[PDB]
Design a protein around this ligand. Structure first.
Ligand code: SF4
Ligand code: SF4
Ligand code: SF4
Lengths: 61, 340, 387, 116, 123, 168, 170, 68, 77, 190
């Protein structure tokens, strides 16, 4: 006979995940490049104007 | 005479007393980075353990190999330690608050980092085994080769400054940071930053598997606390360099709008709070950065030495000369030339 | 005139192994190598001729001490082929899926230990953690951890607990996330990809001439696996893809190991759904013990219970070579039966034995940090090679 | 009397207080406890430091320029850019000669099975 | 594993007693030449002519074997022990197997007659 | 069911191959035998290389790959040791076993001329028995003490050996 | 000198000097207890369990154990796995280049009295015959729980080291 | 988990004297329910709380400072 | 080389199994006159090359059967 | 059909001929887009984000002197000799435990005692070489030696490690509760 030992469910189990769970997250790489140039150029607009500002302050001193 | 000898002690317990808890903090991080608990048996929340490390380490012996000049194995620990400790003058801590202000800041800041190679080259010569010598060779060659680009971006930083005083840079940096215009500069600086320190994305040279049980010398004792503390001083020293000349040094925001709301007059409380917030902005940048070093120490394997020299001279450094051609040119397009 | 030739590791060069290994370096380039193995050499084969097959079984989970269960399995298979007996259906599936969770364990140790040997610290802990979860699953079935007094030459030692077959499914759902997670920082990984792109090329006919097998031979391109070429243990009755590499590099030998997790999990999905009912040991009481329920009640069960534990069971004379696919490689065993109850002789073919023997045909010209990435993907655990 | 000069002098004495503390605190100082012919190299070890000197040196050559860059408006630009454009092709000498290639003699035997 | 180690030879079986004798003579010359290397390498306590007077008497032990092929296995074992000692492969603990009698003078009451055997019932 | 029926149709197949082998090279095959689809071949000691070439080189018979070799003694008989070989046709998914014999004095030749990995295996079964492999570079002991004398897997040789170790 | 004197296992601090010496001893033993640097000797079926202690279930970094696999920085050595004839001089040599406040602990059943290979030919019948071992960790897969318990046993011995109290020669 | 909220709330549940003992005893803050005690004298606990990892549930509070 | 055979006699005298140290003539046979063995042959020849520090090939070592042939060989350096 | 000879059904399978590998121009993505992943280190920051995510999750480790890992009923650690109800030694010297301890850790002498029943005179395990086969548990008809799941018994001398009859009966006295608990979950599955 066979009683008391463990058995699978009569409905079975759910199917498991065995694949590569790899979402290609993020943006397009060109978006990273264009955002890079945007952050850069805005920084340069803050930088060089402040430098010319400092040069006029140097003149004033 | 009285108020300066306390001025140096408070800085000592600000730095030397902190670099130990840095070495506790790295264990706590890599614990939670690898899903385990940090040191918890030792102190209250498992703090303090660097004291238990050092005090035990001060109680072990001074066994010395027969092939080593013992004087040389005294000199190299001491000089590497004091090199990474006298690099601590013109870190700025708020406006103009250094240990000694001098108008040539970066030159000292950079020549002492230039002295930083000189101990590690000298160290492997003692105990003159062939593996022990050639390991010092392999270490020192990368240790100069990225010391190049570490040195070599410091000039393009001061192509916006044109002044060797370090605290001048931050007051220049009030209008905007330098990292946020010059973003890939930060990336190449961060890898150059972990290069000159013995960090294992890059420190292949501490391969015990390759050598006959050799990390550098296995020289241990109160010798061992010396190069060790020098290494972790080097860590947050190059973090400090990253802090001022690339990131917001002690700056957070304007904060005058807040002050005219709070105070009515200058007082020692006002100096206290402003020095607090400037030191805290410096602190928060520095403390995110020391975390980032571990955050890259965890996630990556080590290198081949071929990879390491290929990583210096072929992939990084011509891009650095491209920087040397674009930033004077961008300086040249507009008037834009900085004056002292 | 010769190179300044070194001793690689006395104690702790490669983790889990005493790798004394002569290297002759001319440019930090290995012109030739000579690994002296013998440092773990306990001489186990001289011992196993003096003990009964009954007793001779935990010699072999000591051998290859990161994948105990395949050694247990291959000796049980050699003796069952020798005895002309047949393990029942339930026994076939339970031995199969333990031999595959041990594969999960073996690659989970080996890939992460190799990543530490290279320098990647994070899988070296993320993998050993899930290995502790599998230590638990060895623990409920059989004895303690890491050395299972399990599959007997009659089949299986004993039944499961009442609920392991459930509980392992709760584990098996989350192993996929915990595996793709470590996949995410080693597979693309320009550092790892640089260090492992063509390092130690192994061509096809030279892979055959060096007698190599398992993931290495399947990495070189030859589609050969004992689970599907000369099947057994209902690996026929369980659907199972096999990965096969392209170059002879260490990167295929990496990627195939990453793939076999994904494969051996699918094993567990097709095993836990279709575990049958039936006798877990062999049917008779003449090669393994009767259950302790009825030996206190039956006169016949006692004499079997006594003779199997004084003499043991008698084996027909002959000799067999049974080799199965260990996760290290083809592990073989060559037993020569006296006809007595001690094995007259029993050779092992440890898989890493020829892997170590094929070292300096592969390791020529490469660098000394490159002489570490070659080590732990031929998997020199050194429990195998000497014995 | 300035704390600047105190700082570089006190730290060797701090290092001595950490140095002789082992000699005070230890015990059992030293108990009883082939290299015939070879040393091995490629040019890739010996060349990195030797080539490193002009590329380190040019930073200190470029260093007086960056302080005075406002004075040399639009012309010291031209001079220094000529200087750099000499040095950069001086750099791309070596990368085309592959001076830091440390190449391996592990060749897969290119030559085929020409027979009979 | 195409290539050998430094001193290892392909084993080959001399067809004549004379060719075996030639190989053994060359072999004793190899031991005798490498003997001052051994005292440096294995860091031994004693002197080089003691090594030499052992290497002589060990071949004196097997001077009087008749067979060709038993001297052939004997030569192969001798060549392997040469192969071990010429490298670092033996260690000095394993190297000092060959002098049990030198390092310690035996001890009191080494049994010689019947009686000294008998009083400790032959040890 | 008796677990031998599933072999039988193949086993009776295998014999037709095996007889063929004896018809192929009658100079060197003393005999063949098989027992539950393990084909075993019977080769004189001075006869190894001409068989192993044919086992490697034939298109119908390409085993290409040593798996494991070792020795087994039978001190009851005159030729004392016997040397066993295992191969694996990875094309045709088959195995083959080659037994020769050798007294402790006399050799067997080395198959290191063809099979490259086998030189390691031959290095093993040297030390365990004393059985030689003529024509073999790097013949020396392995997986034993360097200063060891005797051979472990030898039925006269005792279990604990002769010498034990302690730190004087 | 007194004819009766309390044993050093039985003595209590009574002089203020003894309170000072005992607290200083506690600090020294305490730094020796917390910071705790063994050396990776492990070689066999008894080495994966050493790595199982480094695993994230039974952590040793929370105990302060870390494997500086360099015997000059090591406080102690964990002999783990079996011990063969061919290795044993290397074991002695690794014991030699260790600093003086040392211990050694015998993880594994083969490492004490031979274990499962007690009757082999090329084996050392336990590492008693090489190094003086102070704590044995039994268990043939000597349990991580048991290995840590062996470390705690050794740390209790470390608490009873009395390096300071013996200057008064108690 | 191991967040600040959990350790704070369990310290606020247990009581600061037992907390000050427990922090010198273990590194954690753990709030059980006294399932039972020992014949040697050792107070045990068991944790209901939902934010617990596997096999962190039950634990000992010893008696002796020199425990093991 | 003058007085080289004096040094050869000085090395040759230091052995045993020599019934007459004054039988060291420049024409002394090793096996016959000196009463030596096949092992004594390479013993004295290696002692000679060690006395000079020079190294010798195998056949030129093998054929030296008398000290006359040693003084014949000696001017290879 | 008929095969050739040297010819099974093991032909190379359908489409075993691998594609000619793509060159620089047989690539779908732009060189600018490819080199964005080159310089800006996409798969570097990706795994950096992985380990950052693991920073903000739970650890696993336990406080070992305060928390213990999983223990099966069929776990094995040190030994003990059970006793009967109303306290009788339960070990007869069947010597099966001597017969199948594959390291020969068991050593027994035994004599007929006063009342005439067989009992063990000296029962001795060499715990240096008790290899935790657990076969010694499965070899007792009267179920006398068992596997106590204690592992925390680390000694300081080899002398302490020779368990004679008295230590094992003391362990059977001590762990009697847990051995009852374990056999109430294992005696079916034995
Ligand atoms: S303790 Fe156990 S696993 Fe370790 S060496 Fe001994 S027998 Fe092997
Ligand atoms: S578990 Fe212990 S008592 Fe049982 S056979 Fe093994 S060593 Fe002997
Ligand atoms: S415990 Fe069992 S095997 Fe051991 S002596 Fe008693 S009855 Fe026999």
């Amino acid at each position: 006979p066979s009683v008391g030992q463990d058995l699978p469910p009569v409905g079975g189990y759910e199917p498991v995940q065995w694949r590569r769970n790899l979402p290609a997250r993020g943006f397009r790489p060109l978006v990273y490049l264009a955002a890079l140039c945007g952050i850069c150029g805005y920084g340069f607009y803050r930088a060089l104007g402040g430098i010319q500002e400092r040069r006029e302050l140097k003149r004033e001193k | 005479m009285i108020i300066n000898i306390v001025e140096i002690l408070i800085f000592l317990v600000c730095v030397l007393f902190s670099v130990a808890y840095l070495t506790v903090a790295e264990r706590k991080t890599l614990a939670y980075m690898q899903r385990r608990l940090g040191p918890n048996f030792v102190g209250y929340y498992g703090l303090l353990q660097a004291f238990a490390d050092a005090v035990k380490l001060l109680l072990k012996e001074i066994v010395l190999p027969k092939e080593s000049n013992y004087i040389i194995l005294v000199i190299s620990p001491l000089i590497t330690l004091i090199t990474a400790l006298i690099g601590w003058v013109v870190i700025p801590l708020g406006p103009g608050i250094t240990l000694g202000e001098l108008n040539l800041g970066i030159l000292f800041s950079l020549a002492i980092g230039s002295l930083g190679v000189f101990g590690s080259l000298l160290s492997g010569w003692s105990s003159n085994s062939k593996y022990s010598l050639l390991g010092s060779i392999r270490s020192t060659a990368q240790l100069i080769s990225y010391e190049l680009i570490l040195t070599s971006i410091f000039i393009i930083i001061i192509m916006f400054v044109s002044s060797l005083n370090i605290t001048t840079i931050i007051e220049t940096q009030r209008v905007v940071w330098y990292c946020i215009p010059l973003l890939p500069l930060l990336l190449i600086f961060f890898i150059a930053s972990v290069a000159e320190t013995a960090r294992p994305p890059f420190d292949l040279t501490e391969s015990e598997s390759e050598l006959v049980a050799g990390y550098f010398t296995e020289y241990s004792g109160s010798p061992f606390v010396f190069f060790f503390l020098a290494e972790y001083s080097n860590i947050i020293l190059i973090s400090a360099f990253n802090g001022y000349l690339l990131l917001g040094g002690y700056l957070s925001f304007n904060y005058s709008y807040l002050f005219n709301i709070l105070f009515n007059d200058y007082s020692y409380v006002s100096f206290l709070f402003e020095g607090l917030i400037n030191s805290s902005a410096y602190a928060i940048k520095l403390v995110f950065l020391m975390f980032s070093f571990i955050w890259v120490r965890a996630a990556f394997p080590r290198f081949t030495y071929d990879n390491l020299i290929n990583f210096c001279w072929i992939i990084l450094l011509p891009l650095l000369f491209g920087i040397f051609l674009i930033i004077p040119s961008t300086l040249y397009i507009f008037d834009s030339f900085p004056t002292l | 005139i010769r190179a300044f030739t070194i001793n690689f590791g006395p104690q702790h060069p490669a983790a889990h192994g005493v790798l004394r290994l002569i290297l002759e370096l001319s440019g930090e380039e290995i012109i030739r190598s000579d690994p002296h193995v013998g440092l773990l050499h306990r001489g186990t084969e001289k011992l196993i001729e003096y003990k009964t097959y009954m007793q001779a079984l935990p010699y072999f989970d000591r051998l290859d001490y990161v994948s105990m269960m395949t050694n247990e399995q291959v000796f049980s298979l050699a003796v069952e082929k020798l005895l002309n007996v047949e393990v029942p259906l339930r026994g076939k599936y339970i031995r199969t899926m333990f031999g595959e969770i041990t594969r999960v364990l073996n690659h989970l140790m080996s890939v992460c230990s190799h990543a530490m040997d290279v320098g990647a610290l994070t899988p070296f802990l993320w993998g050993f953690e899930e290995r502790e979860k599998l230590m638990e699953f060895y623990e409920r079935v059989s004895g303690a951890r890491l050395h299972a007094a399990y599959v007997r030459p009659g089949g299986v030692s004993q039944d499961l607990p009442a609920g392991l077959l459930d509980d392992i499914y709760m584990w098996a759902t989350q192993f996929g996330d915990r595996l793709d997670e470590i996949e995410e920082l080693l597979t693309d990984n320009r550092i790892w990809k640089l260090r492992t792109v063509n390092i130690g090329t192994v061509t096809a006919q030279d892979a055959l001439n060096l007698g190599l097998s398992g993931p290495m031979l399947r990495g070189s391109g030859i589609p050969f696996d004992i689970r599907k070429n000369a099947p057994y243990d209902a690996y026929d009755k369980v659907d199972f893809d096999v990965p096969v590499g392209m170059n002879g590099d260490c990167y295929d030998r990496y990627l195939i190991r990453m793939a076999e997790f994904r494969q051996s999990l699918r094993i567990i999905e097709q095993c836990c759904n279709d575990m049958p009912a039936g006798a877990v040991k062999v049917e008779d009481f003449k090669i393994n013990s009767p259950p302790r329920n009825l030996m206190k009640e039956d006169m016949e069960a006692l004499i079997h219970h006594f003779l199997l534990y004084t003499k043991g069971y008698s084996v027909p004379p002959g000799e067999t070579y049974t080799a199965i696919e260990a996760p290290k490689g083809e592990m073989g065993v060559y037993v020569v039966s006296d006809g007595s109850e001690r094995p007259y002789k029993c050779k092992i073919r440890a898989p890493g034995f020829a892997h170590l023997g094929a070292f300096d045909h592969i390791a020529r010209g490469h660098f000394l940090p490159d002489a570490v990435a070659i080590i732990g993907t031929m998997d020199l655990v050194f429990g195998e090679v000497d014995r | 009397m300035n704390t600047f000069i105190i700082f570089i002098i006190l730290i060797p004495i701090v290092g001595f207080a950490l140095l002789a503390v082992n000699i005070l605190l230890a015990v059992y100082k030293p108990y009883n406890e082939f290299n015939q012919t070879r040393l091995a190299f490629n040019a890739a070890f010996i060349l990195v430091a030797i080539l490193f000197l002009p590329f380190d040196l040019e930073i200190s050559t470029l260093l007086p320029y960056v302080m005075s860059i406002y004075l040399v408006s639009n012309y010291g630009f031209t001079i220094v850019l000529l200087f750099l454009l000499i040095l950069i092709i001086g750099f791309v000498y070596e990368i085309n000669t592959n001076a830091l290639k440390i190449n391996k003699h592990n060749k897969p035997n290119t030559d085929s099975l020409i027979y009979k | 594993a195409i290539i050998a180690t430094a001193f290892a030879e392909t084993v080959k079986f001399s067809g004549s007693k004379q060719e075996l004798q030639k190989r053994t003579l060359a072999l004793y010359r190899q031991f005798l030449r490498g003997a001052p290397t051994f005292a440096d390498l294995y860091e031994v306590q004693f002197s080089i002519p003691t090594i030499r007077t052992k290497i002589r008497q060990e071949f004196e032990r097997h001077r009087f074997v008749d067979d060709l092929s038993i001297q052939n296995v004997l030569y192969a074992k001798g060549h392997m022990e040469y192969q071990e000692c010429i490298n670092f492969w033996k260690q000095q603990a394993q190297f000092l197997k060959y002098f049990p009698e030198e390092d310690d003078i035996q001890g009191r009451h080494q049994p010689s007659n019947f009686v000294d055997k008998f009083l400790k019932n032959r040890a | 069911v008796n677990p031998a029926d599933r072999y039988l149709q193949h086993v009776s197949d295998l014999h037709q191959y095996a007889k063929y082998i004896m018809a192929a090279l009658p100079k060197y095959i003393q005999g063949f035998s098989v027992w539950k689809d393990e084909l075993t071949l019977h080769v004189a000691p001075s006869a190894v290389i001409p068989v192993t070439t044919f086992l490697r080189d034939n298109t119908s018979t390409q085993y290409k790959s040593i798996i494991d070799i070792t020795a087994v003694d039978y001190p009851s008989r005159e030729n004392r040791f016997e040397v066993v070989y295992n191969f694996l046709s990875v094309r045709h998914n088959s195995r083959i076993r080659l037994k020769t014999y050798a007294t402790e004095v006399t050799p067997v030749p080395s198959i290191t001329c063809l099979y490259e990995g086998a030189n390691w295996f031959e290095r093993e079964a040297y030390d365990m028995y004393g059985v030689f492999f003529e024509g073999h570079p790097d013949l020396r002991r392995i997986m034993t003490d360097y200063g060891f004398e005797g051979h472990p897997l030898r039925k006269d040789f005792p279990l604990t050996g002769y010498t034990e170790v302690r730190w004087d | 000198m007194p004819t009766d004197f309390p044993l050093p296992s039985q003595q209590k601090p009574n002089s203020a000097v003894d309170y000072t010496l005992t607290t200083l001893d506690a600090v020294a033993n305490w730094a020796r207890q917390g910071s705790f640097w063994p050396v990776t000797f492990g070689l066999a079926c008894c080495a994966v369990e050493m790595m199982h202690v480094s695993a994230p279930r039974y952590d040793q970094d929370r105990l302060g154990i870390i494997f500086r696999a360099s015997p000059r920085q090591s406080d102690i050595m964990i002999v783990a796995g079996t011990l063969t004839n061919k290795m044993a001089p290397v074991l002695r040599q690794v014991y030699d280049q260790m600093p003086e406040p040392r211990w050694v602990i015998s993880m594994g059943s083969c490492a004490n009295g031979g274990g499962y290979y007690h009757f082999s030919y090329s084996v050392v019948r336990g590492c008693d015959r090489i190094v003086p071992v102070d704590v044995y960790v039994p268990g043939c897969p000597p349990t991580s729980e048991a290995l840590m318990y062996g470390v705690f046993q050794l740390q209790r011995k470390m608490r009873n080291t009395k390096i300071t109290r013996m200057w008064y020669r108690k | 988990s191991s967040s600040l909220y959990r350790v704070l709330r369990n310290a606020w549940e247990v009581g600061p004297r037992s907390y000050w003992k427990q922090l010198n005893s273990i590194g954690d803050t753990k709030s059980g329910r006294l399932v039972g005690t020992d014949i040697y004298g050792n107070k045990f606990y068991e944790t209901d709380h939902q934010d617990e990892i596997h096999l962190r549930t039950r634990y000992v509070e010893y008696k002796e400072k020199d425990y093991d | 080389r003058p007085d080289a055979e004096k040094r050869i006699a000085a090395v040759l005298e230091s052995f045993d199994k020599i019934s007459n140290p004054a039988a060291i003539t420049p024409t002394a046979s090793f096996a016959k006159d000196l009463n030596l063995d096949s092992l004594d042959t390479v013993e004295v020849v290696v002692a000679i090359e060690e006395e000079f520090g020079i190294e010798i090939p195998d056949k030129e070592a093998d054929e030296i059967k008398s000290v006359n042939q040693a003084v014949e060989y000696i001017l290879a350096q | 059909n008929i095969y050739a000879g040297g010819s099974a059904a093991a032909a190379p399978p359908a489409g075993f001929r691998i594609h000619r590998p793509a060159t620089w121009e047989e690539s779908e993505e732009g060189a600018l887009s490819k080199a964005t992943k080159y310089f800006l280190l996409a798969e570097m920051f990706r795994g950096l984000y992985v380990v950052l995510e693991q920073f903000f999750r739970a650890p696993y480790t336990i406080y070992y002197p305060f928390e213990k890992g999983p223990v099966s009923p069929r776990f094995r650690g040190e030994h003990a000799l059970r006793r009967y109800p109303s306290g009788e030694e339960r070990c007869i010297a069947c010597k099966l435990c001597e017969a199948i301890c594959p390291a020969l850790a068991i050593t027994i002498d035994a004599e007929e005692r006063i009342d005439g029943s067989r009992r063990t005179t000296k029962y001795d395990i060499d715990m240096t070489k008790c290899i935790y086969c657990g076969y010694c548990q499965e070899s007792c008809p009267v179920d006398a030696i068992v596997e106590t799941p204690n592992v925390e018994y680390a000694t300081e001398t080899r002398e302490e490690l020779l368990y004679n009859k008295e230590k094992l009966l003391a362990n059977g006295d001590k762990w009697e509760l847990e051995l009852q608990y374990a056999l109430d979950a294992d005696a079916p599955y034995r």
